[PDB]
């Protein structure tokens, strides 16, 4: 079985490169962050622009939804994160304390906590209600490229240019595991599988790997794409067939079979590096976004 993703919409309106796109957990919305210091909200199913959210003093590298789809968090080069009410567009909180560009962010499932990773080689855990920083993990010896909570929020996975993935106990901040592999290539992205048993990690040697968290063993490898310079988002697609979805520096969206590792589709149409992909929580829908020479988001639909 192979998917047949086809272009449904292109979304234009960011004035610089787009950095991240995410579907709202309720499937209604796509949120995009960009170098032009803006977040934009679009309808997931019709591509209609809904609103712009602004207030960061520099560009935004990541954005994430709360579980109830009511809040957003953004990570910015102005060294802060911001918590936003989506319906009103107002900034509810500004999370300060990182000493460098903030690069990645995510809510936990309960959405009382936010995790962030920064160029200051640190991971921080923040309280949503008060905006205070609860914990600072001396997580890495290089910039932190990704942070992600597991299914129930008891664990944090982080990745860094230092070549390490680290599993942390959220409650204690103690490191439970470190994944190392061979020649220590920079790790550009990491995230838990939906079941929380596996970890998908991108390295800047044109490689994706599926690791079993419990065993510390790499189970699958995915290649054929170009990934050497940027921290590209990758995804588990679970609404139809079980795919791995990633962007690529050859302007293509790559889709692999999870079990067999064969490339099952390449989505063509972007005119720059595809920095971010996102998979719709209930429909076979992919959102992709590209850098300076493109500046657009594309929505793709498939039957499986």
């Amino acid at each position: 079985v192979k998917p047949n993703y086809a272009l449904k919409f292109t979304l234009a309106g960011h004035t610089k490169a787009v950095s991240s796109v995410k579907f709202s957990p309720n499937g209604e919305w796509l949120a995009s962050s960009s170098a032009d210091k803006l977040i934009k909200i679009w309808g997931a199913y019709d591509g209609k622009f809904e609103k712009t959210i602004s207030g960061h003093k520099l560009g935004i590298s990541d954005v994430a939804w709360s579980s109830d789809s009511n809040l957003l968090v953004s990570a910015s080069d102005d060294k802060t994160l911001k918590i936003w009410d989506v319906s009103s567009g107002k900034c509810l909180k500004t999370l300060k304390g990182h000493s460098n560009y903030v690069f990645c962010c995510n809510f936990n499932p309960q959405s009382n906590l936010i995790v962030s990773g920064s160029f200051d080689e640190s991971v921080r855990i923040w309280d949503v209600k008060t905006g205070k920083c609860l914990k600072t993990l001396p997580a890495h010896s290089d910039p932190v490229s990704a942070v992600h909570f597991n299914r129930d929020g008891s664990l944090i996975v982080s990745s860094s240019y230092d070549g390490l993935c680290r599993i942390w106990d959220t409650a204690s901040g103690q490191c439970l595991k470190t994944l190392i592999d061979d020649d220590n290539p920079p790790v550009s992205f990491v995230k838990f599988s939906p079941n929380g048993k596996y970890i998908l990690a991108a390295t800047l040697d044109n490689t994706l790997k599926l690791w079993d968290y419990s065993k510390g063993k790499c189970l699958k490898t995915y290649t054929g794409h170009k990934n050497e310079k940027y921290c590209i988002f990758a995804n588990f697609s679970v609404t139809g067939g079980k795919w791995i979805v990633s962007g690529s520096e050859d302007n293509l969206v790559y889709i692999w079979n999870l079990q067999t590792k064969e490339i099952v589709q390449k989505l063509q149409g972007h005119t720059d590096v595809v920095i971010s992909t996102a998979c719709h929580p209930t429909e076979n829908i992919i959102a992709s976004a590209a850098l300076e020479n493109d500046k657009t988001i594309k929505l793709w639909k498939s039957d499986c």
Partner: peptide
């Protein structure tokens, strides 16, 4: 700056 190469 995710939009800039390393």
């Amino acid at each position: 700056m995710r939009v800039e190469p390393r």
